[PDB]
Amino acid sequence: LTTEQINMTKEQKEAQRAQTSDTRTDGTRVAGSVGKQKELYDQQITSYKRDAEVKAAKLFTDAWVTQKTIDEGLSPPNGFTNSSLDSILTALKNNNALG
Amino acid sequence: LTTEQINMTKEQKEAQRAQTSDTRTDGTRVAGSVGKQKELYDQQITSYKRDAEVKAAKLFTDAWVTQKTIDEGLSPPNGFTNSSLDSILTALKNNNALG
Amino acid sequence: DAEVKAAKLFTDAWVTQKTIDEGLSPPNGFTNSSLDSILTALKNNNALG
Amino acid sequence: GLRPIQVMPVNVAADSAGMTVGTHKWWNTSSNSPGDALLAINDMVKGLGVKPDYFIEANPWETMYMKDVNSSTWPALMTAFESSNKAMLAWMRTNWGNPNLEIWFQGATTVWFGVAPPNDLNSEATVTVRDKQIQMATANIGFKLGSFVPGSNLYTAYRNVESSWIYYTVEAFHATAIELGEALALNINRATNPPDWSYLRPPANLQGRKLATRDIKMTWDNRAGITHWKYANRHVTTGAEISSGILTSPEYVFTLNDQQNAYNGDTLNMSFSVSEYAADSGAVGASSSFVGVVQNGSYMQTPTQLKAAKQLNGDIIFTWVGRPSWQHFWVVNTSVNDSKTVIFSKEWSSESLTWTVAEQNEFYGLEEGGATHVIFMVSEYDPSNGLVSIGAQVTGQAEQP
Numbered sequence: 001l002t003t004e005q006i007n008m009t010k011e012q013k014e015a016q017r018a019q020t021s022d023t024r025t026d027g028t029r030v031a032g033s034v035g036k037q038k039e040l041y042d043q044q045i046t047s048y049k050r051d052a053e054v055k056a057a058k059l060f061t062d063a064w065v066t067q068k069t070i071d072e073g074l075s076p077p078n079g080f081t082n083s084s085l086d087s088i089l090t091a092l093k094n095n096n097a098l099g
Numbered sequence: 100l101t102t103e104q105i106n107m108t109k110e111q112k113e114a115q116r117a118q119t120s121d122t123r124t125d126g127t128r129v130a131g132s133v134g135k136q137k138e139l140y141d142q143q144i145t146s147y148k149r150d151a152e153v154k155a156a157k158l159f160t161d162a163w164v165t166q167k168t169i170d171e172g173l174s175p176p177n178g179f180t181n182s183s184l185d186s187i188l189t190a191l192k193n194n195n196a197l198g
Numbered sequence: 199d200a201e202v203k204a205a206k207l208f209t210d211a212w213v214t215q216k217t218i219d220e221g222l223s224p225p226n227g228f229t230n231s232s233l234d235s236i237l238t239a240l241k242n243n244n245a246l247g
Numbered sequence: 248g249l250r251p252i253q254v255m256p257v258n259v260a261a262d263s264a265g266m267t268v269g270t271h272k273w274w275n276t277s278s279n280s281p282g283d284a285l286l287a288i289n290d291m292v293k294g295l296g297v298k299p300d301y302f303i304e305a306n307p308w309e310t311m312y313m314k315d316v317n318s319s320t321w322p323a324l325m326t327a328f329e330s331s332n333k334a335m336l337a338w339m340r341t342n343w344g345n346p347n348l349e350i351w352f353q354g355a356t357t358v359w360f361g362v363a364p365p366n367d368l369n370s371e372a373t374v375t376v377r378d379k380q381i382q383m384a385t386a387n388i389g390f391k392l393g394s395f396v397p398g399s400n401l402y403t404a405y406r407n408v409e410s411s412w413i414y415y416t417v418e419a420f421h422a423t424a425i426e427l428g429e430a431l432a433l434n435i436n437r438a439t440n441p442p443d444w445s446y447l448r449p450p451a452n453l454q455g456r457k458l459a460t461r462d463i464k465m466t467w468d469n470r471a472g473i474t475h476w477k478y479a480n481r482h483v484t485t486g487a488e489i490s491s492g493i494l495t496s497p498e499y500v501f502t503l504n505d506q507q508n509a510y511n512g513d514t515l516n517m518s519f520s521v522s523e524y525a526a527d528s529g530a531v532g533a534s535s536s537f538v539g540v541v542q543n544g545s546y547m548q549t550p551t552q553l554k555a556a557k558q559l560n561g562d563i564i565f566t567w568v569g570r571p572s573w574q575h576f577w578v579v580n581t582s583v584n585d586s587k588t589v590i591f592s593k594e595w596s597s598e599s600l601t602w603t604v605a606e607q608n609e610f611y612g613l614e615e616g617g618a619t620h621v622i623f624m625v626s627e628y629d630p631s632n633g634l635v636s637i638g639a640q641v642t643g644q645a646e647q648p
Contacts, residue, residue, distance in 0.1 A: 001101055001104055001105060001108065004105055004108040004109060004112075005108060007108075007109075007112050007124075008108055008111060008112045008115060011112050011115035011116050012115050014115070014116075014118070014119045014120070015115055015118050015119065017119070018118060018119050024119055024120075030118075030119040030120075031119070031120065031121050032116075032117055032118040032119040032120045032121060032129075032133075033117055033118045033133055033136065033137060034118050034119060035119065036137045036140045036141075037140070039140070039144060040140050040143065040144055043144045043147050043148060044147065046148075047147045047148075047150075047151055050151045050155075051151070054151075054154055054155050054158070057158060058158070061158050061161070061162060064162070065161070065162065065165050068165060068166065068169065069165065069169055072169050072170070076162070076166060079159070080159065080162045080163060080166070082174065082176045084159075085159055085160070085163060085176050085178065086176050086177060086178050088156050088159055088160075089176065089178030089179070089183075089208075090178065091152070091511075092152065092153065092156055092204050092207070092208075093178075093183075093186070093187065093507075094507050094511055094512040094513070095149060095152060095204075095507075095511060096149065096200055096201045096204040096205075096507075097190070097201065097504050097507040097508050098186065098187045098190050098201065098204065098205065098507075099186045099187070099190070099461075099503050099504065099507060146199075146200055149200045149204075150200065153200070153203055153204050153207070156207060157207070160207050160210070160211060163211070164210070164211060164214050167214060167215065167218065168214065168218055171218050171219070175211070175215060178208075179208065179211045179212060179215070181223065181225045181641070181642060181643060181644070182553075182640045182641050182642040182643075183208075184208055184209070184212060184225050184227065185225055185226060185227055185642045185643065186503075187205050187208055188225065188227030188228070188232075189227065189586065190201070190504060191201065191202070191205060192227075192235070192236065194201060196239070197235065197236045197239050198235050198236075198239070221647070223643070223644035223645070223646065223647075224644070225642070225643055225644075226583055226620045226622075226642060226643035226644065229583075229620065229643075231584070
C-alpha cells in the first residue's frame, strides 16, 4: 500500500504543478482538465474583448441608418455593398454547417 | 481490507492523472466523467466563438434591409437567393428531426 | 442553438423582400407540403394528437 | 510432452538484415553463399554442441525495402527471395548436420502512421510477400508456415509508437509465441488453411470525384464475391478519424454538411481509406488509402445568372449565361416531392433549355398545368475529360408569365 501511495503523491504533485506552471515535472505541457479549463478562459477573454467592439460599433452604424432614411440618395459605404456582404453570408453557412 | 485499498488507491490515482494528462497510466485515453466534461468545454468554446460571429453579422445585414425598404429595386445579394436559402431550410429540418 | 439563430438572419432578409416585392415566388422549403411534415411531427412529439 | 528444460531457444536476429537486401546481408546474390550477417553467427552455431532442429523466420527486411522502390522491381525481388531461401536451406541442411532441418515462416506485417492510422503502402506490398511464402510452405518440401501474428490486419496489434506504427505490443509476441510453438510441436502447417483475411484483397483503384455540388464521391471497382466494404475517413491535417462503417456498395459520398463540421468550409484535399469487408465472418483485409487532392474540374468556369420562367402554355424554360467557347453544360433535374429523385440528367449544348409541359405531367403524374416548383442544376461540362465544374443552382418555382 505504501508503494501505491507513491504514485498518488506524484500525481497530486502534478495537480499542484498545474498552477504557476504550464509544464509537468517531465516537461510536457499540461493537457488534462486544468489544461482545458485554461483554454476556456482564453476564449472568454477574447469574447469579452470582441463583445466590447460590436456594441461600440452599434453607435456608428445607428448614426448612418438614420441618415439614409431621411437623406435618401446618400451613397452607402463600400462595406455595405452587395459583394462585401456575400463573404459574411458564405462564412455563416460554413461556420454553422448550414450548407 | 488492505488488498482492497490497493485498487482504490490506483483508481484515485487515475482521477488525479485526469488532470494535466489526457491518458491513463496504461496509456488509454480518459473517457469517464472527466472526459465527458472536457468535451462540453470544447463545444462551449466553439459556441462562444460562433456567438460572436452571428451578432457581428447582425450589423451588416441590418444596414442592407434598411436600404431595400427605401431603395426598392436594389438587387439582393446572391446569398439571399431562393436557391441559397433552400440548403439552410433542408438542414434545419434534418438537424431537428422535423421531417 | 447556434444553427437556428444563424438561420434567423437569412430568413429575415427574405421576409422583408416578400412584403415589399410581392409576387416573388417563395422558396420550396416554405411550400404548403413542406410545412405539413413539420406540423405532423410537432403534434406527435408533444402528444398533442 | 518434453520437459521445459529440454527445449532451448537462441537468438540469431540481425538488425534490419535481409537475404537479398538490407543493412546486413544474410545471403550473397553474386555467388550463393552466406552473407556477412549469417557468417558472423555460423561459428557459434557449430560450437553449440547440438545440431539445430527448427529455424524460425518472421519478417524479411525486403518488405520494408519494397515500400520506397517502384512496383516493377517487386517481382524481381520475389525471384531473388525464393532463390536465396532455397540456397540458404540447402547450405545449412548439410553443414549443420541436421538432415531434416525445417524453416518455419511467420506472417508478414504492414506499417501504419498516426492515431487511428490508415494502412501504408506496405499493405499492397506485403500481400505479394504474403502470397509468396504460402506456396513455399505448401508446394515445396523444407519450408513451413509457422503462424501469423494475431490481429495482423488490425492496427491495435502493433501499437508500439504514436506515429509510424511498425513494431508489435508486449502481448503480441506472447500471443504469437503460443501459436507458433503449437505448430512446431504438432508439426501442423498453417499454409493448408490460411485465415479469412488472407483471401481478402485491397481494392484495385481508389479515387474521388467532386460533383456539381461541393460534395465529394469516392469510387472504387467492385470484386466478384465481395458484397461489403469497410471505409475510414479521417481529418486531412490533424489525422483524427471522421467517419467509418460498412458499405454495401463500392461507392462513398462526402456531403457538404459533413465537411462543414470537420472544417470551417469545404476542402479539396482528402485522406481516405477503404477495404473489403466480409459480412459472413467480420474479417477485414488489406486497406487501400488515398491521400492528396481529389479529382476536380476547378479550371473551368461556373455558370452564372440562372433564371427559370414558366410560359403561358405551361412549359418551363431555363436560361443561364456562361462561356460560349465552352458551350457544354451538364444539366440535372430533381423532383420536389422528394429532393433526390432525378427527373433527367443530360449533356446540353445551349445556354437555354425548354422543359415541355407534356413530360412535366408525365413525371409527376399530373394531368394539366405541369410542375410549378422544379429543382434545377446546370454546370459547365468538359466532353474531353468528363470533369464537372462547380455549377450554379436555381431551385423550385419559376417566375410567372
